[PDB]
Each structure stands twice: as C-alpha cells, then as structure tokens.
Amino acid sequence: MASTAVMMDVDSSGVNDLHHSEKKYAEEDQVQELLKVLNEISKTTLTLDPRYIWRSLKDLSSLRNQELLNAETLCFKTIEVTAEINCFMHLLVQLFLWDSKELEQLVEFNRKVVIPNLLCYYNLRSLNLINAKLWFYIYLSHETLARSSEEINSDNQNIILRSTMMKFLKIASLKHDNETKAMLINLILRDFLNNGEVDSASDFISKLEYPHTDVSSSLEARYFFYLSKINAIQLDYSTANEYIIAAIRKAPHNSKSLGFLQQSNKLHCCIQLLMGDIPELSFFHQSNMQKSLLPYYHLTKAVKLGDLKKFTSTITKYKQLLLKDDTYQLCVRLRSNVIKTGIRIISLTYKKISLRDICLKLNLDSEQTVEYMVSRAIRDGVIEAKINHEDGFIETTELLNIYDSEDPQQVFDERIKFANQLHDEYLVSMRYPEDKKTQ
Amino acid sequence: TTAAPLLALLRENQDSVKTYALESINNVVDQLWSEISNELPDIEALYDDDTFSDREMAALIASKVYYNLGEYESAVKYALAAKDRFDIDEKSQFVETIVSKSIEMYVQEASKQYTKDEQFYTKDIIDPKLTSIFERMIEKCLKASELKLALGIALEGYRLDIIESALKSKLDQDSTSENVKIINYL
Amino acid sequence: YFKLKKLEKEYELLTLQEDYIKDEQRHLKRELKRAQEEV
C-alpha cells in the first residue's frame, strides 16, 4: 500500500544506490522514468507519514515534516543522505498540486530545502537532481500573482530567484553544471516575457544554449521556444522560426503538445505571417484552434487578402486572445505588408502599370501617399518595380531569372550540411551499440 | 531590482555616486551583471580612472560579470586588480571559483617560468598578486596542513621555498616517520 | 586540492589512453588497405 508506494521509492532508492554507486545514467533516467511513475501511487497519506519514519531520523527530514504537517509518528547518517535529498527531490515532486495546493508554504521550504545542505556540494555529484523548473514551477504557479503585492519590494524573491538561479548560473561551472541552466534563463526569459525585454538574452545567448547533450530536448526546445520570441521582437523571423524549426516535434511532446505546443505553434504561425508566407493552415485548422490557430487563420484569412479593416477586425476581435498570448504587438506590421503583398499581384505582371492604375489600387486605398506607399513598398523590395512620376508610370520589373546561380546550390549546402546529417550522426550512434557490447 | 538606474548611475558623475553605484551595484551585480554586461565598456574605462578609487569594485564587479560571462583572465585580472573587493576568505563559489580559476593560470606560467629558469618563482615575472594568493592559499594549504595538497601544487609550483619550508617547518613539528614518508610519498 | 595530486594525476594516463589509440587507429586503417590489396 504505502509500502508499494515506498517500494517504488525503495526501488528508486535502490537505483539511487545505483547512483550511490556512480552516475546515475540509469538513476537519473530512472529518476526521470520514475518521475513519470511519480503520478501513479502518490498521495502523502502514509506516503509522507511513514516517509518521516522511513526517513527517520534526519533533521531536514524532520524539517521537511513541516511540509508534512500531519499525523504520522510511528517508528521504523549515510543511507539516509541523498535519498532524503532524492526524497527532497520527491519533496519537490510531492508538491505539483500533487500533494499540495499552495506551495508558498513550500516556497520558503524550497529555499529551506534548496539552501540548506543543498545547493552546495553537488557540482558533478547531484546530476540535475535539481529541477529548477520544479523549483520555480512552484513560483510559476505563485506568479499567478497578482496577489503577492510584489511583495516585498518588487518582486525581490523572484529577483533573488533570478539571482538564486544566477547563484546556480554561478554554480553553473560548465563542469556539466548545465542541464537545468537555461530553464533558469527560460524562467528569466519568460520573466522578460512576463514584463521584460530579453536583450540580455543576447548576454544569455553570449554564454550558451543549454549545452548540450544531456538536456531534455524539451527544455532544449523550450529553450528555442523562448529563444524564438527573442528574435520575435528582435524581428528575426527565420531564426526564430528556425528555433521553432528546431523546436516542435523534436522534444516529443504530445501531452505537452496540447496546451504547450499550441503556444509553440501559435508563435510558429506568426512567423510566416512575419514572412508573409501563410503556410496552409489546412492542418493548422486542427489540433489548433479550438484554442490556438484560427485567429491566426483569421489573420491568415486576412493575411491572404490583407484587408486592413478586415484584418484589423480580426485583431479587433481577437486582440484579447492576441493580448492573452501577447501576439498583439505583431501583425500591425503585416497589415500593409499584405497590402503590399497584393501590390505585387495587382499586376506588377505588366512591366509597369501606369501611375494611376497602380495608384488606382491605392486610389482604392489612398492617393499620393501612393508615392510613399509605393516607395514604402519599393523601400524594402518585397516587390521589384520602378517608377517615375515625371512619367507617372509605375514600372514593374521582370522578376525573371534563368537562375544558373548558386541560389539552389546554397540550398544544396543546406542539403550538403545534411549530407553528413545522420550520415555523421550514425557514427554518433555507432558507438552506443558496439561500445556497450564491450561492457 | 533591475539595473537600469545603476546602469544610469554608472555614467552619472560624483564618484561618490559611482561608488554608491558600484557599491549597490556590487551587491546586486550577481543577478544584474546581465543587464550590466553592456556597461562593461565604461566599467573598463572606470577601472582606468585613478580618480575614482574604488574602481577595483567595478574590476571585481566586472570579474563577477566575467565569470557570469565566462571571462576569467579578464575576471582574474580585475579580481587581481581588486585585492580589496577581493579576498580569499571571502566565500562565494565564484570567489572560490575565480581563485581556483586564477590559480591554474599560475601553474603553466610558473611552469613556463620553470621552463627557462627553475628559480623563476624566486623572481617577479609572475604577477605576485596571484603568486601571493597562490602562496596565500598555499599558506591555507599549510593551514590545511595536508601538504601533498600544497606539494602537488608546489610540485607543479616548483617552489622548493614552499616545499622545503613546508617540510622543514613540518619537520620539527611532528610526524617523525611521516615527515620522512611525506617526502617519500611525494 | 589534496587527493587529486594522488588521484587527478592518474588521469594523465587516461589522456594517453586516447593517445595510444588514434595512433593505432590509422594502423588498422592502413593495415586494412595494403592487406585490402591481396584479399
């Protein structure tokens, strides 16, 4: 009962002993796999209650009993050490809103776990036994505040947290003090994405990516995810998307595909919009709005035409949803960008049109702003045409190439950069089978 | 909070302020160096102002940023610059880090110094600050009083001055057989 | 500091451990080919 619950923990500790032997390749991944099983048995009931006894007796075990705060008692310096830590790990784990509601109790306890006999000697020893998400994921909830007043001065705990995360960024010694790291950034990233301007993202960028291997693709993607939104208002789109194009499947999420990958996808949709591409939402119809795309579709729906009014209306309608996702800031650019997109297909087709037909479309829109509006267009390219008002003839270029250029061969170097792609990464995965034959 | 004022206080005059900037900054560098990492160009120039005394603040502050930037011979240099803002007994992983970081530098230096001269360490060529702090930790190593700890360093440290004294001192101290063996062990 | 001069130093070996091999690597590599001949 509580046994089998603990029996899992026992077996986990059994594998924690496999860590108490050495890394933990199993044990962590075990703990990871165990962290999956963490859902099943659970409660605290005699879980935490005998856990005290099962722990008994360590001080911090009794300290954690403050988190227990129940009727346990009963009966039951070395075998109790990292287990307790691993249970302090579970102590975190316990609290997911699993076995908890307000972690603000545990907020303090977080520190009062993290700080004491913890956050100290672990550099290579504890191998991301820290889950700073699980650390912060607590505060993540609390950041539903609002309430806290911030709180405090503003909001220094989260500040101190950033500093405390910095205190790991400190402790991130690149000794493999890594995995959790850019979550701390992802935090600070999304902390910028709370109120902030990431641009120390560049400084975050200055350090590193979550190097490298041992990190969950998730956070590695969730890295990119935020790392995209850097380039979002950094106004790099490709690379942002490239992050999404480094993000999505790719960190397998399916469970997290639901709420979370929409977010991802939500941003992804915005990209080609920023690039004016509007890929086929034909799938993005589905596993989507419902709760994610369709405003983007409405956007796309607009962005296909880009009728400012009709466009704006989307925003006008979905602004709050935009606002909810802070995608509002976007799309304001893309307004005329599609209007300009249409401009290209207004028949730039004729090697011109005269001024006032290409004005006519603006004589459908505005006048002699045309001059600007076309210069506004011709400015960025996005169309290649010419004019002179002296002629009043708006001269729309060929846009015609017999290519024979490196242009595709760029796209080959692309391919070529994948000529090794797994071709190399096979040799990467040649070791694992055959050198584990050597063991 | 966020460093924007301290970012602003930076260029603001009254080296008093700059102190209290740097002061307040120094304490909150740890987090906010990130924002501050862009102010380093001035901070550099700040360390180049003999007018403003405390700039060793900023130097070690920059060193904080530099670990936080992964810059070390940068950081070390400005930690070396500090001497005051810096101290060995000051305990941060960072401090412990930068020291240990600062340290290793000595070795090859000393070894490169050892290369040409084997009395190199009797001389000035290595930044004495390091050498000091080096030996100061060697002193701490002596106060650690497990001396292979010191020796294997001074082994690579090539400093018999350390070594022999470490022996000789320890010689009269205790470990009748060990002071013999400690040698043998080494 | 301490036990590493004992311990750490023993890893210089493990450095060489690599250095033993990639040498011997090309061996089989060539030992392949001139032998790859006659077969």
Binding site: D435, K437, T438 | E96, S100 | E8, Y11, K22
Partner: peptide, 28 residues
C-alpha cells in the same frame, strides 16, 4: 581547494574520446 577539484572534469570529460577510439577499435 577546489583548485584541482574540477581538474578531473577536464580529463573526466576525456572519458569520451577514449570511447570513440573504443568505438573505432571495433569499427576498425
């Protein structure tokens, strides 16, 4: 102190290039 501490992690990281050559061993 931690002076030589992480010095492991230098060669401790080297554990790999071994195994490449180890992969290579077979592979060769």
């Amino acid at each position: 102190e931690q002076k030589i501490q992480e010095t492991e992690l230098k060669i401790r990281s080297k554990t790999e290039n071994v195994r490449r050559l180890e992969a290579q061993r077979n592979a060769l």
